[PDB]
RNA sequence: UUGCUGCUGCUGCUGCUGCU
RNA sequence: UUGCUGCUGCUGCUGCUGCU
């Protein structure tokens, strides 16, 4: 068991689910389920797919999947005194966004993974 | 020879202008020459080392490095029928970001990754 | 484009090394 | 943190494969 550094459950699809999907949408490169995005932390990786519709309502409930606190406080159980490297991905229609760096740039990797994050997601389609 | 998607030469320092600023500066992570970044497609990379100061003047000018059409000129030159690889990748002050996907997705990448450059470029210290 | 296995080719990050 | 060499461990992208 590990401490995740997100805030809400895994969404993944089933296959069936992913099939029905597939069978009553146009192009599903266009429309997927949601997006998926992941949190890594020297070689421990925390992953999530995530339901997102493009609409406010879901765009806000997504963004609150994990915060700076939730990441620091799941990512210092790996910290000591040499630097580990910290990842953040996100992909959603085809584009991939990571960001990366050292433990000791994890504020910064934060900020700027949420920036991400909210403009990948937003992105005209 | 190829045709680069950059709109502006490398400014990479040499070592002993790298060394000189080193001994000049108090924090040289806090306050870079500039900036680094790259656009891949393939297997061929093609970098820059940009000099920036963050300054409006200076964010200007390094958004002017590479444009979607100066990107899809260049990117074009490797395409076909099968899709590639395509990856931007930029690196300020220990934070990296990469964006990438397959050639068919790569105006949106180039919008992802100007949003990116600027978000980074622009990030409070 | 759900999740995963094996292969490939590139990238990015951390650490280490030897120049510059 | 200039640029590069060799090593390591992770990731991400493209293509391919076999499930789901």
New interface residues.
Partial sequence: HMTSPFKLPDESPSWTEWRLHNDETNSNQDNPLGFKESWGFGKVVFKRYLRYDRTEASLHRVLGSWTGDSVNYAASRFFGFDQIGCTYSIRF??????????S??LQ??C??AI??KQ??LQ??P
Same sequence: chains 1, 2.
């Fill in positions: 229609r085809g584009v991939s966004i990571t960001v990366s760096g050292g000791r740039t910064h990797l900020e700027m920036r991400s403009e990948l992105l005209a």
